[PDB]
Amino acid sequence: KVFGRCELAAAMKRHGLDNYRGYSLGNWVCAAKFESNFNTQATNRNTDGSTDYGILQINSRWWCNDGRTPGSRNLCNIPCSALLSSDITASVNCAKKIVSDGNGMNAWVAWRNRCKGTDVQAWIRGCRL
Ligand SMILES: [Cl-]
Ligand SMILES: [Cl-]
Ligand SMILES: [Cl-]
Ligand SMILES: [Cl-]
Ligand SMILES: [Cs+]
Ligand SMILES: [Cs+]
Ligand SMILES: [Cs+]
Ligand SMILES: [Cs+]
Ligand SMILES: [Cs+]
Ligand SMILES: [Cs+]
Ligand SMILES: [Cs+]
Ligand SMILES: [Cs+]
Ligand SMILES: [Cs+]
Ligand SMILES: [Cs+]
Ligand SMILES: [Cs+]
Ligand SMILES: [Cs+]
Ligand SMILES: [Cs+]
Ligand SMILES: [Cs+]
Ligand SMILES: [Cs+]
Ligand SMILES: [Cs+]
C-alpha cells in the first residue's frame, strides 16, 4: 500500500507512534516518506545482505526475520514480510522497538539525514488526525 501522507500520519497515530519515544508524528511520517515513500511494500537490500522492509525500512539484520540475513536477531520477532503489510501495525510495533533501541530515530539513517532537525510537522500539516 502506498499511503498518503496524512493517511499514514493517521495510521501511525492510530498505532501509537505519535510522539512515541518523543518523536512527533511528523518525524515518523518523514521517516516513512524517505524510507519507503509511504509504500508499505518497499524492500531494499542493504549492502550488507540484510534487507529493509516496509514503510519504515526495518532491517532484517536486527529486527525482522527474512530468512536470508545471516545474523538476523529478529528482535521484532516478526517475519520481515509482515513489515510489508498494508496494515502498519507490525512496522509500527517493530519501529517502536527500533526507536527504543537507544539512538532514537537515528536508527533510520534517512530520518537522521533527511528528517532530523527539519520541520517535520510539515509532514502532518493539513492532516486531520
Ligand atoms: Cl508526501
Ligand atoms: Cl510533527
Ligand atoms: Cl535470516
Ligand atoms: Cl531520542
Ligand atoms: Cs504515543
Ligand atoms: Cs501525542
Ligand atoms: Cs532504492
Ligand atoms: Cs539497494
Ligand atoms: Cs537500504
Ligand atoms: Cs539502508
Ligand atoms: Cs532503506
Ligand atoms: Cs542495531
Ligand atoms: Cs533466520
Ligand atoms: Cs537469523
Ligand atoms: Cs528473536
Ligand atoms: Cs511480534
Ligand atoms: Cs541497545
Ligand atoms: Cs543501539
Ligand atoms: Cs540503521
Ligand atoms: Cs535544521
Swiss-Prot record:
Substrate binds at D101. It holds the Pfam family Lys. Its main location: secreted. In the egg white and polymorphonuclear leukocytes. One of its GO terms (cellular component) is extracellular space. Keywords: Allergen, Antimicrobial, Bacteriolytic enzyme, Disulfide bond, Glycosidase, Hydrolase, Secreted, Signal. InterPro entries: Glyco_hydro_22 (IPR001916), Glyco_hydro_22_CS (IPR019799), Glyco_hydro_22_lys (IPR000974), Lysozyme-like_dom_sf (IPR023346). The keyword Transport does not apply. Belongs to the glycosyl hydrolase 22 family. This is Lysozyme C. It comes from Gallus gallus (Chicken).
